Amino acid sequence: ADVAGTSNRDFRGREQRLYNSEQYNYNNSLNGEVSLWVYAYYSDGSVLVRNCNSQYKVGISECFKSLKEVRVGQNNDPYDEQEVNNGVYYPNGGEPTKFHSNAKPRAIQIIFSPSVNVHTIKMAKGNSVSIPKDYLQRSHPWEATGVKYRKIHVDGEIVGYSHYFELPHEYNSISLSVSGVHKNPSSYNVAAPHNIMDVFQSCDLALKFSNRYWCELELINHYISAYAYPYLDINNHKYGVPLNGRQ
Ligand SMILES: Nc1nc2c(ncn2[C@@H]2O[C@H](COP(=O)(O)OP(=O)(O)OP(=O)(O)O)[C@@H](O)[C@H]2O)c(=O)[nH]1
Ligand SMILES: Nc1ncnc2c1ncn2[C@@H]1O[C@H](COP(=O)(O)OP(=O)(O)OP(=O)(O)O)[C@@H](O)[C@H]1O
Ligand SMILES: [Cl-]
Ligand SMILES: [Mg+2]
Ligand SMILES: [Mg+2]
């Protein structure tokens, strides 16, 4: 046989490149996943991830309470934190023993898989009682924030998209929903009658994941890197696996 890495008959090499290219392109096909991660960062350095993976479109919807840090199996002062909730839903509305709950997120990162179309991204960043813009009567139920999403590049490939905002002020008390639609450069509408019921089933079939990792390092190591997910850390370092046309 020919010698490795010297000719056009390195079929092992060609197969490796095709395998990676096939995965990249499968993900972008209408058969493929689109994925959404919402990261809530807490002052103790831990990070809650909410993830949903689904065909056609994907979303996550959280309220003020559900974004709060919960240390499973440890003390969370649940009565005091209910009083925090009461005091955040209406000023002077509760009697907790604290001015600022350390269970409040300090920041949010939203990451989409590379198979999203950024023009379809919508976000409802609402107030603490789940209204998009102060009062329902004046609220558009979402903002289209795609122009703010940064490309996560690795080796010149877009491995995902990130929108990051800090919540450093005392009044940054939010509710949050996010939605994105899978790429569809074809004119075949996946939700027109020929395929519409499959999109309804995709709502059933969407797989969700949630966990609180003790720090960003642990998240990078045992979540992001373990499962070939895109990520952008606090030092603006990019994580992901470039696949298209690559060995
Ligand atoms: N493209 C390129 N890569 C370099 C160069 N010097 C060092 N590198 C390293 O080599 C890596 C790319 O090597 P290859 O993947 O084998 O070459 P390629 O440019 O991708 O071309 P292909 O054979 O089509 O894959 C990069 O990740 C760089 O870190 C250079 O001058 N050009
Ligand atoms: N020293 C080099 N000279 C020429 N081309 C390179 C070199 N290093 C990488 N490249 C090529 O340039 C393209 C972009 O790769 P690069 O490593 O810059 O991507 P990146 O990870 O987005 O970069 P960075 O995160 O450092 O800004 C890739 O196709 C890669 O093969
Ligand atoms: Cl397709
Ligand atoms: Mg009292
Ligand atoms: Mg290469």
Author numbering: 2 to 248
Share the article's original sentences.
The polyhedrin microcrystals diffracted to a high resolution of 1.5 Å. A total number of 51 datasets were collected at different positions on the chip of which 23 datasets could be indexed and 22 were merged into the final dataset. No obvious signs of radiation damage can be observed upon inspection of the Fo-Fc difference electron densities. Seleno-methionine labeled polyhedrin crystals are typically of lower quality and exhibit worse diffraction properties than their native counterparts. Thus, with similar data collection parameters, the higher resolution achieved in our experiment is very likely a consequence of the efficient removal of mother liquor and the use of single crystalline silicon as a low-background substrate for the chip. As a result diffraction data collected from seleno-methionine labeled polyhedrin microcrystals loaded onto our chip are of superior quality compared to diffraction data from conventionally mounted native crystals. The doses applied to the crystals, 28.5 MGy in case of polyhedrin and 20.2 MGy in case of lysozyme, are below the acceptable dose limits for cryocrystallography as reported in the literature. The structure determinations are based on measurements of 52 polyhedrin and 139 lysozyme microcrystals with sizes of 4 micrometer and smaller.
